[PDB]
Design a protein around this ligand. Sequence first.
Ligand SMILES: CN[C@@H]1CCc2c(ccc(O)c2O)[C@H]1O
Length: 287
Amino acid sequence: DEVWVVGMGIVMSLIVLAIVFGNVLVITAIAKFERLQTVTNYFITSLACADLVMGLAVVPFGAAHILTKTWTFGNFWCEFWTSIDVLCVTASIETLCVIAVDRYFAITSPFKYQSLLTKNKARVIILMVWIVSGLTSFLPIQMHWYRATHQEAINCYAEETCCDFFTNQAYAIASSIVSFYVPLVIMVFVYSRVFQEAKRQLQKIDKSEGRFHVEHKALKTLGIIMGTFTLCWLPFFIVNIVHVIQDNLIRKEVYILLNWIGYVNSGFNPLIYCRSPDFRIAFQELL
Ligand SMILES: CN[C@@H]1CCc2c(ccc(O)c2O)[C@H]1O
């Protein structure tokens, strides 16, 4: 009466369904209606594209790998799958930073905002983000610049039915730095400044109209924005650093679980970044 195959399969299918449904809905809502076509919504389009590619490509095959315990395809497909996984992850995480910086420049520089950011510059920014994402993903993995040296790694690399992730110290550290830490620092600085500006505005209003009845909301919005990202992706990169720093500190199952915890963050992005009333009207019209 085992339920391992049935129990995990249902949840794994449900995650794919949720990700694909949400991202397709967001993409078609932005594309079909001319009201929602805005410079800010291009970054949302890029993030939705990255998460949709993730949900269609990396999750279904990882599900088969976990359920079956063998890689029925060749080594070339294993390398391609690893490359596309890294590409999608880094592209999404960097697009989040781009959105944060966009909001920073919108709020802290109101008079000059319409000047420095034009619809032409957004295309260049998105192209640069995707190119940088592709440089760290396909170039090192496809040229065997990330491979390990120990006997277990060699045996895994020399077998067609095994597909496991083995990496050396330099690639792991560089990939973690490029993918996670710099965007995290930039987002922290940006959102701290935004919170300061909001508090200053509230204090300004209070002095002017305090007598008549005329920061919970800002704290709630910043918490919803930051806590989910931190909880989803912070645990994984710490163990990513440790497992090459320390040989036998961390088991493989913990690594896989913490990797899969970060995958579900793609299904939450429509809930966080697409709650605008215009988006709700568009969703009502489509469905
Ligand atoms: C096989 N899973 C990979 C392993 C390493 C890695 C991931 C994502 C982003 C990175 O920058 C990485 O270095 C994970 O998705």
